[PDB]
């Protein structure tokens, strides 16, 4: 896109919860950019307090950046009623809940309930990964067939994958989930329910993710009863700002 | 130029906010005067990011990308320096532990305390969740959530007769402006809560004094009351950036 909007943005990806401040040689090794323009960018964005300079010399996300990020948690902060279901869900399956949405030729997960288990999904909410792997993915793509050819050219089985891709969203369809093992990431499974409007579109995935030990065939029949009643109260309530 | 280009990112940025959660494209040109080809060809990039997601009513709101600090955001939280400065002298004064609750969903949480030296005091954990049904903090939150006291009062050990019980307490304390009980959370603990606002008065935290029953006496009340009332007045004042 716009070059130093991508910038400034991948700029702000290097802080995150493992990296709460970062020195500006940090950021110039990050973000691959050359120091002199780095200098300016954190000036400019020191300026407007989008980055806190602090007393150790290293920097932080500054009060309007932390502002953003506030506003945009209630924005997207599904109602109450919903997370308590999401919790109840992790609860009852010692899996940790995602509720994804597609932006583009990505998922994201945009409200999550982990569950206590030491090893479990702690997929980052508001990372965009992509949708050809996993089980929400070709849930989200249900509501979107036009993108299905764009999405395998996108999958590093590339273009001539689209048919079997399309196989696989329509087999989800007729199940009315999609239960995966190992597409994403080694060791990794995932169980997703279509969450939809007034209209029966789908405009979210429910999702559970966690080790595909787990996710065995004598665990997932009550996984899939529990995330499906889930789906289904959740779509009842409604998710408003989707 | 490439500076340029990121001023106008934080001037489209900048115009969202609690009041104005979404915008139109024709907002995000009135507000910033900046060419409408130009705003356009920005809020593509953004949207292409998640930074901003385009919705079916036209607008555009914060998109997922944001989220993504979120967990940073709520780790790293902390009061204004002056605000912990108040609350550590209120706990000097006081010799109790001085909490700041907030709500979260139908439960409190302690997101920061200063415990006072004494050898018998109230040690609640910080960043668990208790109960909204019991002491002097939920009842302060529930002035700025009466919607939510049915549910509370379904959430208690306590029989059906409590949900009105419950919503004329927190009417006491609006009226009085604090709230001062004994043994509600458990036997031998009392406290005192004043609320905590944003600029418009809205009730955004619960400064908070737990401690033994023994020490909340008749000659010790006023004054635990006057330190609390001046500090929280003090807070509010100052302002509580992140909660408001």
């Given at each position: 896109?716009?070059?130093?909007?991508?910038?400034?943005?991948?700029?702000?990806?290097?802080?995150?919860?493992?990296?709460?401040?970062?020195?500006?040689?940090?950021?110039?090794?990050?973000?691959?950019?050359?120091?002199?323009?780095?200098?300016?960018?954190?000036?400019?964005?020191?300026?407007?307090?989008?980055?806190?300079?602090?007393?150790?010399?290293?920097?932080?996300?500054?009060?309007?950046?932390?502002?953003?990020?506030?506003?945009?948690?209630?924005?997207?902060?599904?109602?109450?009623?919903?997370?308590?279901?999401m919790r109840?869900?992790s609860a009852?399956?010692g899996e940790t809940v995602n509720?994804?949405?597609?932006?583009?030729?990505?998922?994201?997960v945009?409200?999550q309930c982990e569950s206590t288990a030491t090893?479990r999904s702690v997929i980052?909410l508001?990372?965009?990964?992509?949708?050809?792997?996993?089980?929400?993915?070709?849930?989200?793509?249900?509501?979107?067939?036009?993108?299905?050819?764009?999405?395998?050219?996108?999958?590093?089985?590339?273009?001539?994958?689209?048919?079997?891709?399309?196989?696989?969203?329509?087999?989800?369809?007729?199940?009315?989930?999609?239960?995966?093992?190992?597409?994403?990431?080694?060791?990794?499974?995932?169980?997703?329910?279509?969450?939809?409007?007034?209209?029966?579109?789908?405009?979210?995935?429910?999702?559970?993710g966690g080790?595909?030990?787990?996710?065995?065939?004598?665990?997932?029949?009550?996984?899939?009863?529990?995330?499906?009643?889930?789906?289904?109260?959740?779509?009842?309530?409604?998710?408003?700002?989707?």
């Open positions: 896109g716009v070059r130093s909007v991508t910038r400034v943005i991948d700029l702000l990806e290097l802080f995150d919860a493992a990296h709460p401040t970062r020195s500006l040689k940090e950021l110039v090794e990050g973000t691959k950019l050359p120091k002199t323009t780095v200098v300016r960018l954190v000036a400019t964005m020191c300026a407007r307090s989008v980055l806190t300079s602090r007393a150790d010399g290293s920097y932080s996300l500054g009060p309007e950046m932390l502002r953003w990020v506030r506003l945009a948690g209630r924005t997207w902060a599904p109602p109450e009623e919903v997370v308590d279901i109840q869900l009852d399956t509720l994804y949405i597609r932006q583009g030729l990505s998922r994201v945009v409200a090893v980052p508001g990372v965009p990964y992509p949708l050809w792997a996993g089980a929400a993915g070709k849930i989200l793509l249900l509501a979107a067939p036009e993108l299905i050819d764009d999405v395998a050219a996108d999958s590093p089985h590339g273009p001539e994958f689209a048919d079997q891709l399309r196989e696989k969203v329509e087999d989800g369809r007729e199940r009315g989930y999609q239960l995966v093992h190992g597409e994403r990431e080694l060791g990794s499974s995932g169980l997703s329910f279509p969450l939809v409007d007034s209209h029966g579109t789908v405009v979210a995935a429910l999702t559970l080790p595909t030990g787990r996710f065995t065939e004598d665990r997932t029949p009550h996984y899939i009863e529990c995330t499906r009643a889930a789906a289904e109260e959740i779509s009842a309530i409604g998710l408003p700002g989707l």
